[PDB]
Design a binder for this molecule. Structure first.
Ligand code: DHE
Ligand code: DHE
Ligand code: HEC
Ligand code: HEC
Lengths: 551, 542
């Protein structure tokens, strides 16, 4: 129950927490909570508890807290356990997990009551939220602005509920657009025309980059809590579909790539792969798109299943439900784009799927604590050959896995090396084919100087002799020149040419933030992006690198 | 509609009552709970989300109020809701208990996963210890496996001598018997979710393995793709909503799949999508699973249970029973409440047609395939809701215009039909009328002469066989049900189903002459229902 470096990246269901619930009746031996009391506790539960224990309390990373179990444990036991506080959430916006005496008692009582299941969100609800602002026929048939679309960066302005579209070469903010709250990620259609963003509240906006003044052409809500979205990337299926994944309800939705019409909703409720026990809250995590078959690649967290969803026929729906490892989160494709490599973070494993054959190929422990790759980093190691790398939230380690069964069979799907970077609390590792450098952030590190810096390894100097590769430390936050607070540096993203790498210098909503552009060839400061509209900059996605999965 | 009597034997704790609602004691609540599952959940759902009856969830019931609930439960209504109070079925006190129960928040019903299945899993005779060849002198292919419903037993009856070879104790009210593809293993599934596997090669055939797969179940099937003989068995449950693939030699539970999910049309989450009929493909190594409330037909590929390939086919809600056409390529199934037949191509794994039968509530069983003299290959179903028999063309290549179209519809004995039957060696089509209110009809079967069918629009005449009268049974309500042929297709058996404390029988009809051949009576023959001939079941010959 204490704040660790790798247990702050758990879902915070604060959109779902805004919903009012009814106070349930209490069985013998338990006292009922009033309307206000129950809602107050429920709000606290959804905000700072449901991530680990579930909205239904059936357990996720933390054990089940269902009434049968809690009543047997008792109030006193729960009261004393809960009085210590809960693990803090994410900086600049998460909770500290600090509850008072009034709050501690409420939570213990709440746990003894029978939880109601939050509302579902089906086709009826999605279609009511579905708005097409500019029908396809009224859109341009060619690019009508003079922007360099492929070198554009789509930047989340988290707490402002906006995104910024920034010129990759001039650093000019081309436009700031209103979207869903706290957009989690931006994704691009395969042609690079359409920009899709998903907010944590389940709101999806679709933006047409060919318009003289790009704006939202369609929107829809797919759930109450959502984090992922992806576009069809199989050759021949460019711009055909988009897919969104939600934490609640546990489901994914396949939408029309031009209009966002909801075409197919699939529940992810089901059995765990290992113990084969029903789980009523299997959250959708990362969603990728196959380059080998017309399929979406969907990580289902709590049941530990990777779904290969064939979008060629939504009525006679072909899926492959791959038993993998529980706690699947994020991942990426290898350099050849054939293998999906994903972190079952809580179990410290990397699951490898062959997207061509539709089957599990390997499961390997990284030797680190809580691997968090993002999409990861593919590069050619001088000794090992093609590798994919991940850093970790729980420790300072960077792990390399061999990704070339044909050319380097002895190294394929084995952890080939593990070495330290700046410190624990890393979120994102990054490289590019044109770069000789591997960048590693340390976003969640408790030490301000570490969290405001990035480690940079010289790939060319790597020998894989077992020693610890040296790294250069770039003082990104210092380069940005921010006086107030202790801004967190997060997520490297390259430009189209792979000559410059951008980092977010993420400060609070009413504090000063920036984007820092690094010249990859020299590792020197190229440019500092500051603007009054640049509020809480987090994720940044280069159009070309996102549409092509170049990482 | 289903009766979840097994789920009702569980004692649940009395839940809390929110403000404005009166609480029930543990005893009162438990009494109401048992009644709910035993008599109410079939139509209303275990979770009270509604199926054939309206939803009875607390948000809806509280708006209606106690008085409304009490009145509705007492006098019922014309639209399918029994008059529990005025009929005397439930005492006045029990009616009030149910009204109060409906206003309360029901605890979630127990799940039944791998741990629970493995705990119930018993292997009496390991495969290594079983015979390597048939060790009895029985003609196994001509053997009939007959449910003795209320006795929780089955009777293995010789197809030629009509001798009850053995009476075996199994799960309560076995719903169906199924045979492995080799004809060696006999699988039965009780309503309670209990599966028994019997080795017919033993000197004295008995259960070699058993397992429980849920709380309420109705379906079981074996792997029938060439090369996959005896490899797997699959069972389907009403509760929990799931299907389980088991090892075909030991019953080891290998893969459990939840059927909870979205309805095909309105795409809304449904928390209780019951598994109905389960068939086995002859074109691909797949099981064919009907999921009732969501209207999905699942094609589940058993070649790899870890990287599980399925095809979820959007069909029509209320899928129940069905069968393969004569070629064994197309699966034709009734979406009964919507009066539709859904046709799936098992080779291509896609929906091919959805057609209304023109009748009310088609109930085919596995149906009846035959070559109609003018229409070509057809598949027939009778109906529960009316006296009609419908024919659908099943030959897209050879009779294209007729394929997947209702080609003829004509009357049989009356409404309340459950099973229609024929055999390739027979020229007759037999149709029961089991649920008809008229005893004369309920104890008789209609027989149509396929050779005389001209498909000219006129209604084909039928002969009426007085099955119950032939059995010499008039006491109680002897309800004649389900024709089943012997291996050669020269005789047809019907069950004369009477109450457990009444006299029942099996009636064997000579298919050539349409005359009484033999009456099977025995004190052990309690409530005989389903009968399955080993050869006809293993080969899907119907
Ligand atoms: C499932 C998921 C993905 C994969 C998306 C995909 O495949 O399309 C993802 C990716 C991401 C990516 C993708 C980077 C990439 O290069 O692919 C980024 C930048 C990101 C920035 C943040 N994430 Fe993320 N993130 C969650 C979930 C996820 N984050 C959480 O449940 C969580 C932990 C808290 C929450 O309630 O949302 C969380 C907190 C954060 C942040 O506090 C971050 C740093 C900032 C923010 O804007 O909210 N997450
Ligand atoms: C899902 C299902 C199947 C398909 C099995 C398969 O594919 O393996 C089926 C088949 C059947 C079959 C298969 C016949 C065949 O030739 O395939 C028979 C004989 C049968 C005898 C009865 N069924 Fe059945 N039956 C139900 C369900 C089902 N019955 C019910 O939900 C229902 C309506 C009520 C109930 O609570 O069980 C019900 C009442 C009955 C009877 O009252 C019957 C007549 C007698 C009995 O023993 O309970 N059902
Ligand atoms: C993720 C970091 C957590 C958050 C946020 C909260 N809890 Fe938790 N809890 C977590 C763990 C890892 C564990 C230990 C057991 C395990 O799963 O390994 C727990 C345990 C509890 C308990 C103890 C119950 C028991 O059976 O001993 C309680 C009562 C509990 N958690 C309640 C709770 C509440 C009320 C929270 C909101 C503030 C909360 N937890 C947050 C992980 C995490
Ligand atoms: C299937 C034959 C049923 C069984 C067994 C029971 N009920 Fe029923 N119920 C059924 C239907 C088809 C309907 C719809 C209303 C109509 O006009 O027929 C109902 C309705 C109810 C209601 C009223 C709900 C409303 O009006 O919105 C109640 C309170 C109800 N049913 C309760 C109930 C109970 C307690 C039962 C067990 C004794 C029971 N029903 C059995 C169908 C069937």
């Amino acid at each position: 129950h204490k704040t660790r470096t790798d247990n702050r990246y758990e879902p915070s269901l604060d959109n779902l927490a805004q919903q009012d619930v009814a106070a349930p009746g209490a069985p013998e031996g338990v006292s009922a909570l009033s309307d206000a009391q129950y809602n107050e506790a429920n709000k606290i539960y959804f905000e700072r508890c449901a991530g680990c224990h579930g909205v239904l309390r059936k357990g996720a990373t933390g054990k089940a807290l269902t009434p049968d179990l809690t009543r047997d444990l008792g109030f006193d036991y729960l009261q004393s356990f809960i009085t210590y506080g809960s693990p803090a959430g994410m900086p600049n916006w998460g909770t500290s997990g600090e509850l008072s005496a009034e709050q501690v008692d409420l939570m213990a009582n709440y746990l003894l009551l029978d939880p109601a299941a939050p509302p579902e969100f089906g086709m009826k609800e999605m279609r009511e939220s579905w708005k097409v602002h500019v029908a396809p026929e009224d859109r341009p048939t060619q690019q009508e602005n003079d922007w360099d679309l492929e070198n554009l960066f789509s930047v989340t302005l988290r707490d402002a509920g906006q995104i910024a579209l920034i010129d990759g070469a001039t650093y000019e903010i081309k436009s700031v657009l209103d979207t869903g709250y706290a957009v989690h990620i931006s994704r691009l259609s395969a042609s690079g025309r359409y920009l899709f963003v998903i907010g944590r509240d389940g709101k999806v906006n679709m933006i047409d980059l060919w318009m003289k003044e790009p704006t939202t052409v369609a929107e829809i809500k797919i759930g109450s809590e959502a984090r992922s979205i992806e576009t069809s990337k199989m050759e021949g299926w460019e711009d055909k579909y988009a897919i969104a994944g939600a934490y609640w309800p546990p489901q994914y939705v396949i939408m029309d790539g031009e209009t966002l019409e909801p075409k197919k909703i699939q529940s992810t409720r089901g059995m765990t792969y290992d113990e084969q026990e029903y789980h009523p809250e299997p959250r959708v995590a990362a969603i990728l798109a196959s380059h080998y078959r017309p399929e979406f690649i969907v990580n289902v967290k709590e049941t530990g299943k990777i779904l290969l969803v064939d979008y060629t026929d939504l009525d006679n729906l072909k899926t492959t439900e791959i038993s993998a490892e529980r706690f699947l989160h994020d991942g990426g494709l290898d350099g050849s784009h054939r293998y999906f490599i994903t972190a079952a973070n809580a179990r410290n494993k990397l699951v490898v799927i062959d997207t061509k054959e539709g089957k599990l190929v390997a499961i390997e422990d990284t030797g680190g604590q809580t691997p968090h790759p993002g999409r990861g980093a593919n590069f050619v190691h001088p000794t090992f050959g093609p590798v994919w790398a991940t850093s970790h939230m729980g420790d300072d380690s960077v792990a390399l896995i061999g990704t070339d069964p044909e050319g380097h069979p002895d190294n394929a799907w084995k952890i080939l090396d593990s070495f330290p970077a700046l410190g624990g609390g890393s979120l994102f590792i990054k490289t590019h084919p044109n770069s000789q450098y591997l960048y590693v952030d340390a976003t969640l590190n408790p030490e301000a100087e570490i969290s405001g810096s990035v480690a940079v390894f010289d790939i060319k100097a790597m020998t894989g002799d077992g020693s610890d590769p040296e790294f250069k430390t770039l003082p990104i936050a210092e380069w940005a020149g921010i006086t107030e607070g202790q801004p967190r540096v997060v997520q490297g993203e390259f430009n189209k040419d792979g000559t410059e790498v951008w980092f977010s210098v993420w400060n609070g909503k009413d504090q000063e933030s920036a984007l820092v552009v690094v010249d990859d060839k020299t590792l020197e400061l190229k440019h500092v992006i500051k603007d009054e509209r640049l509020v809480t900059p987090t994720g940044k996605f280069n159009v070309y690198n996102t549409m092509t999965d170049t990482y």
